[PDB]
Structure 1
Amino acid sequence: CAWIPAKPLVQGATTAQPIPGPVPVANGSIFQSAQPI
């Protein structure tokens, strides 16, 4: 009865790969902000 396939409570992926960030613009500044929310 413990061998019956079951759906977990927290479905899906339990990890997220950090997304690489945008390439800085060529404006002469060190501060570069990604697409602001």
Structure 2
Amino acid sequence: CAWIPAKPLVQGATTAQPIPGPVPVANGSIFQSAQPI
């Protein structure tokens, strides 16, 4: 049937939310690098 609930091939949430970057440390620098892996 077409009314029986089936799960989709691509499961879970299909979107992501950007996260705010860290607060810049108050040295004399403009270049701020978030923790780099």
TM-score, normalised to structure 2, is 0.91
| Deviation for aligned residue 1:21 | 0.5
3-state DSSP of counterpart to 2:8? coil
TM-score, normalised to structure 1, is 0.91
RMSD (Å), alpha carbons: 0.5
Query: What CA deviation, in whole Å up to 9, does each residue of 1:1-37 have, x standing for no partner?
Result: 1000011011011000000100000111000000111
| Structure 2 stretches lacking a partner, 5+ long | none
Instruction: Return structure 1 stretches of 4+ with deviation > 6 angstroms.
Output: none
Seq. identity, %: 100
